[model samples]
Target chain A: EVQLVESGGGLVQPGGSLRLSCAVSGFPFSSYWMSWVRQAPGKGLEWVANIKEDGSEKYYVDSVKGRFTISRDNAKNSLYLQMNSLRAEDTAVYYCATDPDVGLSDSWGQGTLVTVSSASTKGPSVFPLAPSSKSTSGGTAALGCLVKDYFPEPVTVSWNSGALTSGVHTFPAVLQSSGLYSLSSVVTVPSSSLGTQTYICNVNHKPSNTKVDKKVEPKSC
Target chain B: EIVLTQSPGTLSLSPGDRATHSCRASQSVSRSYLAWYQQKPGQTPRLFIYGASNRATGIPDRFSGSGSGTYFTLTISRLEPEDFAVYYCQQYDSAPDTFGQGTRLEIKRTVAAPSVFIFPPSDEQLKSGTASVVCLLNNFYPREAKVQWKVDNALQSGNSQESVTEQDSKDSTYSLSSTLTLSKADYEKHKVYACEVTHQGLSSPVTKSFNRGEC
Candidate 1:
């Protein structure tokens, strides 16, 4: 499963441009498509468009396609949205959506608030990093989990040793601002050991009590 | 871009009530390609009728729909708790078509009633716990419907949950259930949970909520 943590608080000069990012963690960077959506104040949501991991394809509504560009860096599992010729009307909350297919959004980035003001302010920022898990035997592995933007900030990452005594672990924090941050942790075990081990990520935000966990097993590559 | 409009912000009806909703395109929408959706609180909109009068694949016979020439209607002979939600219409016939604003179908809560039991309850409890809760529906109309679960108003993963449907009484009605299991610690906290029922023929979803612990 992949989770998105978007940049926050974007401000651009009325005539300038803006760039916001949706950073994804917990899943393979190449497996999904990242999209952007906009919800104007008091208006229904509108699909902005999508960009593939290869950065080869893009889709958008006919009306606004010309003003937007979507780019991705698969190595970092990050998607970028650059809107040009910013105007006061462009002020709204922009969301980064992860759509594996054409249907609904499976994972989303916390929305980035973008406002076009007279003075240039920093664009929204997102910190995305993959979480890795290893089996006791360490023969085979599962990479990451999926996350949606709806989850609030200050998320936590954890590891569980199945049947075997848990080993040492290191958890790192990626700070984006004063109160908002992203987290990733790693745990290592011997490859000869065999059993089901689990890695978990939990966040306590509004609409709280949400967590994501993945089971890892050793397999012959 | 096609603009859609639905008259009457709200419709009050009861079981056996025959209701008609009109969805008119701002401009003439040819191709007879209209769709409807139902959205209830705390759930995503469900598609009910699509491709004009033709029902969505696997839909029940009772929930019939008919209309054309930029107008459409979704009819339900018997209203259920799951059917209480806002209904909407969309025109997919052309590019950049939009959904109708929305029409809420109000439900009058009965007094001195047994607490309505929800099958899966809320995902909040299941996520941190080991028990799986299943929502069971019997004598339910509409043979085919998509069921989804939400925790604190957010959609949960359906792949991890088990959903089953059985025929009840006459073939006209059937029963359906979905179970979501998580750690017990997660369910302890009181949270708002909802189930969303969707059909291709309907534009939105019928959502029902369950409360845990006394407010």
Candidate 2:
């Protein structure tokens, strides 16, 4: 019943650091020692450190030693990892978890995809991939949006009717062998909302500027 | 293994209402690691069922999840307020665990304001010259409301007891209680005491006043 939720995976330009947190819920957070692990594009998993709130356990890999600080907040039931002096190489999917085996993380959060880039200017092509729906007799329908083939990683896919409301960005954005990325997310929209409003796949990718908005028409929800 | 897709985007129902949701796998999963969850607004999703039919650690029996790996169904005999959120039928046993798009549940009902009830003075108040009053809060959806006490317009503190908010699975309403203690002399002198409750369901705080005669 224990759950770990990852957050704060966003754009971090070179030389700029970022903090990622894994919030523990469902059970006592201090029951086990939590560790931070990360994986780069098409790379092996790296064990960073085991974060203990009571300072009970501590270990650091040779690469991240002194460069990363791992700590925890007992009151908030949250585990934190502060990565300072970052670079493009640090861009990877970071995960916080316990139940650590000899060399792997058994239980995990929705691995946060942190993109650390420098001088990148490639914006992803934002558009609808496969938009489908199931209408019911009650006039409500389930809407699924698959945003495909985005680039530069770390692309945040959100759903929008008018405001930034509705839809959930499902965890762990998938990356292909070619370095391209695709995101899968869903939002349950009412039948009336479809004809009244056109949904857009709002993509914020690559940089502080490359925002590509693609409109999707639910022709038959 | 095939991608799991769900239908009927949203379910709008009231508490005590029985709801059934389903998920279809593009290919046969053979019923290995499929699981279900209920996520409320601003809250983390909780595992409702796993292993296709086995309920999560503390899940109630009212929820019966079944079906083959390719096609799954989660039946809620009676929905609780805590059950009134997005329900996702996902696979937890596999890497890059495939998801079922998921069905979101929204409740269509009126929220009730927190009801406050103060316990009567006890014999200890007469003998020890001090009193203990318990404020019970019931029928609230979320347990996020705050309970405060004031005596003659001054805040009262110390020896305050509160009950963990309890929820009614039938209606999905919540109940909570709190208590404050003070000297009988202070209570007689102050001549006025009040219990104030604030909740999202109420436009203003629900306050109850008691005079010295109650003591």
Candidate 3:
């Protein structure tokens, strides 16, 4: 029998961003719109919005007017929903649906619960750690860092060991509803005494930042 | 928010008996439309009532519905063993039309074994095990679908469950699943188990049933 299989559940920090998927089976390639619905614990049904099979059109219900967007991948018969600026009150079961005919949603997939926990005010910002002198072997290093006010948009946190390379390491920061974000990633430095190495944090938001650097001294005490 | 609720307790009737099921709406549903459904075991639910009194496309006349304003009733006369299943009443006068918790009508038996049971290990365990029952259908044509379970022909409190689906395929087929858990004791004595699936486009409900202890 034709069916819709949705991914399990999700956990997101409040004031953060989230994305979930619903995949369908035993259906043709096109000619249908995939929609989203919400049912808060013991509450009545609410319509979110829907995306065209070709990823061209979008529609939202009046209740959830602004905070949600729908996208679809016709090739895989799957639909995706990306929600921003999470809040504890936003936790509930979300489902993917499709109207079999004109105005009714007759077919539905199993539901997935998305939970929003702790809230954060802001995410990490990019800064450069001053070039180090005398590379100490297996020692402690203090890296300078700075973070800007957390925005509700999706941003990436990355650490650069040297010059811009394809191997730059990126880490995810936790966002809380109280307007704060924290994240950490690990990097290994070779034991060298003469090489000057730089550690940097690169933040990806509009009006990118490449200023400021933090210096670390590895001590063998 | 027009609310619809079902009565508590099963309506016990024999093959030649008659049974009446009722549904009440919170607000006056004069502009609202009412429909009824029937669900038999293992098979998809079939529509029995719609738009107050209009019979669905090809429903049997044995099943009839009559009601006015906010209240409605679905009565089955000269019941057949096949008619011994769950019945539901639905309102389509508003967005997200709702379904009444279902009513199970069954025949009173003298000596009975559980109709549906755990397959293996019939011996050793004189007590039959429990089973989780569900009703599924191609609800592809309605805008919404709701499901409910009844024990002994009465609405099971905290047992009313509803679901909505919009994943219709190119073939115009939609599917929805509703479930309930039953104990061995409830399954043995209860001759009928019902699953009522309701939708907005449906003039009446589509019902399915399970006959316990039957070989």
Candidate 4:
């Protein structure tokens, strides 16, 4: 029943900072050590760092030792990997693992993708969007927005001017085989309102501080 | 090509016992750039020790690797239920990557025998003239099972293809499936097709049969 939950991975600009979190549960947090492992695109597994259960000892790989900090907060039951002055080669799927004994990752968290890219060349690619009515008379229809080929995953999607959260579901950013990130969010609304309302998919890229919008009207559907 | 030979092809041990596996290289390796992997039935191998003795991240002290040049050893201080699987060594120091013949670690006690099931060909497959049937062997242990196809009690050939064995995540058991494809002309000649599986867990071969129209 042991579990390691990792979060806070996204695209970071070169020379920027990124902090990854690993929240622990279902076991004694102070009894075992935790570790961070990563694999770059098309590369093999690489051990990044490991921290003792009580935070009294730690070890880091030479490649990132000076820029990577491995620490833990016993009160929060969480471990942290704070990386500084990152580079493009630092992009990888960061995995958090733990074990009661020698720290072989007996248990693992679904890894999070950390992309280090510059805003000028790599960001998000927002595709066109439209609405689909399951039944023309069913009163409700669905609209989706696909954001693809993004580096780092610090992008947010909103529906109808960021007002509709009740019927909206945003999927987690997934790493693609091409080494980029992709995600989609869908929103449901009343079919009758489509005739008079204009739906907009607003995408906000946090690193670049830019907002891009795609509007879908009745004619487009 | 560099070849890696593992010794003591099979290890019979119980839980809490220490397991030591050896891998020897045909030629001297540089920097001891050898890696060890643990593979459960039906799962991808997990790299546990790389660069010979260094444990990969999250590997506990129980699992350790040591050796250099031409010989290496992987040791598990205490065995767990899940640790009883196939382990192999890989060398990446040379141009052509090489893997050792795997070592199977099986429990000393009685293992689970496979549950054999034979499925008749589907109607769509029959209509397409290339009918196929499947023989599934589920929930076995140790991954050493042989499957044979028989047509009307006579050994048949050329139509059977065995699948890669898979390990069950929950129980670490193994399952495999074999498919037999036949042309329309060949399908009509066989009345009853049987699947015979021989495993260490069984006193004799387990057989399951299916008629052409049994579905």
Candidate 5:
């Protein structure tokens, strides 16, 4: 009667995080070691992580060393797999199991499917910018552009036409209310050449096939 | 902590006959936490026996399980037509839940073509925001067949999250029902729903469709 009920499987966009759970019954959960095994589509079984019965040790494969965590809830007789920064390659059926001995897993939870989808992806929304200063002749001024409403981050932003060596400042994409992302990039420019220089903010986002360039004029900020 | 080996690999039987199967463990299991499951082709396994001999909720008394230590047994007092499928034994006595290679119970009889029928969603089902259509394939012999649901002549595609299959049998013939669910609001977009059956007895697949626009 050593029963394990496992769940938490479904569609997930790439780069998303997931937590799969296994609830054990009919046996003492703290007396036996537990493991997590996954099989990618069309691939063989791949051992992902394992935890000691006494919670003194944990073993993980090289692929999930940092991104995957195994923890237990002794009070609830449950085990969990907290996975972060998922990729398409992480798509598989994750089976929670119990290890009889080292490197050998025996009892298993009915596996659940986890799909790291690259579908319904979208690109960043790039907005035009304006210089922060009206006077374009003497001091240094700043030009900022907004990139918002994007999915699955890590966007590349570059200034096409500007004096942008050490003055480019880009912030990380912040999650918005719509479950999308928004970020801002600023470039420092000399106010003296604001009227003569043209700044082009190029946002490269390929997942959704969006390549955008926002021009910055002197008077608009 | 024990290895399980199911014997006979294949058990050939008939309706009304008694069927018995065995699962032998590598070592004495602690407290006999063994389980039994029944699985049909292209379907999920259904657990019927747990904790050695305890029948799961809704499991019939005709399906009995017993045994301990190194040997476990499952007996179908009187096999039904639908019971001629695969059965598996799982042990939960210690860590590393182990399952025996399944024992498939095949019917000893010959082939019979199924009578395909489609039951349209009822008015009550349509009022509930979700509508379901049931496709029943009855009186098929050998109990092996493939079923698919289609809409508007195109094969219904996508994950199986929207459908479920159940089986019932009469005498020596098998009866199966495949149910597909859809949002009631989207029913207007679909003109037809079809149930397609492929079996050994038929040269071509049998299809029965229901037209939402017609009635």
Candidate 6:
């Protein structure tokens, strides 16, 4: 009855490190064990790391031993992973979940993709644009968040509707230069909500350590 | 730790062709520890197989994996346009997992020179002995071209600031724009000017000329 959200993705060069986060919500946080799981693009799942509420201790997959550190935040009911000295073999889809009991998973977060790439890191410049209408025929207007000059790939862009969570969010990251990526994500909502509703753009650039957010609220009509 | 290696550094094959990628471990590996991935250009690498032969969820039936113990193979019965990419194999059976160098998939296509145009100042603005010219270049692939201006067939310097702008096309080609501003006083003595575009495919630079039609 609870949800786990995994955010952030993309690539890291050899010897580079990336931190992944799992935000826990919707269920009682302290009652379960949180773990990080991974699957190479098309492989079976491998348990990467784990942290428990019962004790302040953790475990990691043998393949990634010592290279990954797992930690948690009781305040936010979130889990964090610091994957260090990564190589191409370290790239995979990472998921966070809870085992109501040992060797079993009940709540699962959407997997985040990670690739070890020879990409350069560039802090990005991001901003949110005013919401615009697609057509007057409907009450819907699209609000967009623009991202530019971010390094590596798999930048995550999510829309925060404040307390409203029902809407469509679509965005794509494009390679403008050899290693720099760009994205223009748009979240569609009722035009009437502009100025009255606040929309936030959350951008995550993992290995490059570029995290940005932009919010826009229109003056109510 | 096992080291993984992929055969054929690059594949320049066409879609509908069979693609057989090999992944070999330095030492004997368990079948369950081998996996293959597809890394498309500028895109994230996707897991294609695990346990040496199991396909990831929803993967096309055309893709299949086989072999085991120190060697493995990923076979695409028929390659699709989207299948063109760099493929890699990873071994996770031991500590300090290792990955293959990656095999690239490529298709040959010609990317012609960029389109160049100049924006000139109005008549009233030129009388001040200062004129600004904006040279724009578009539709170049590889995104590695440079911009240069010349006065009367001789190379000219300064009077320009470059902002490399690129938009990726749906076809994987790139559209780029470079801006160069020139002051008329700096080139008042010049008769003609040109903007040269250069790239890896350019045998001879593509030059576009804008004549100084004085007042």
Fnat values, one per model, are 0.01, 0.00, 0.00, 0.07, 0.00, 0.00
Q: What lDDT tens digits, residue by residue, belong to model 2 across residues B1-215?
A: 34677776878677678888989887666555676766543233456776777776557888888998478998888866666666777653333344566687655456777655444344433465655444556567555788888888787765554544223434656555454656676666775667789988889998765654442
TM-score of 2: 0.36
TM-score for all predictions? 0.38, 0.36, 0.34, 0.42, 0.42, 0.49
TM-score of chain A of 4: 0.57
Model 2 lDDT at residue B23: 90
iRMS of every model, one decimal? 17.9, 23.2, 25.4, 16.1, 23.3, 12.9
Query: Individual DockQ of the candidates?
Result: 0.04, 0.01, 0.01, 0.04, 0.01, 0.03
Q: Which ten residues in a row have the lowest lDDT in candidate 2 chain A?
A: A128-137
Which residue pairs does candidate 6 place in steric collision?
A: A41-B47, A42-B47, A42-B48, A195-A218
Model 6 misplaced regions, further than 4 Å: A1-19, A23-68, A71-79, A82-221, B41-43, B109-194, B198-205, B209-215
Off by over 4 Å in 5: A1-7, A12-17, A22-79, A83-111, A116-221, B28-31, B39-47, B56-58, B82-85, B106-110, B114-139, B143-215
Per-residue lDDT tens digits of candidate 3, residues B123-173?
A: 112243543343434324432456656655766555322233322222222
**Steric overlap count per candidate:** 45, 3, 46, 13, 9, 4
Q: Give residue A31's lDDT in candidate 4 (0 to 100).
A: 76
The lDDT of model 6 is 0.62
Once model 6 is optimally superposed onto the true structure by TM-score, how far is the C-alpha of residue A140 displaced, in angstroms?
30
Query: Model 1 residue B215 lDDT?
Result: 19
Which number leads on TM-score? 6
Q: Which should have the higher TM-score, number 1 or number 6?
A: 6
Better of 4 and 6 by lDDT: 4
Look at candidate 4 and tell me the lDDT of residue B59.
68
> In candidate 4, what are the lDDT values of residues A19-133, reduced to their tens digit?
8998887767777677776766544445577777789878776678789999999888888999999998899888775531332433556677787876543467665333222
DockQ of 1: 0.04
* lDDT score of residue A127 within candidate 3: 27
Give the per-residue Cα lDDT of candidate 4 at B137.
67
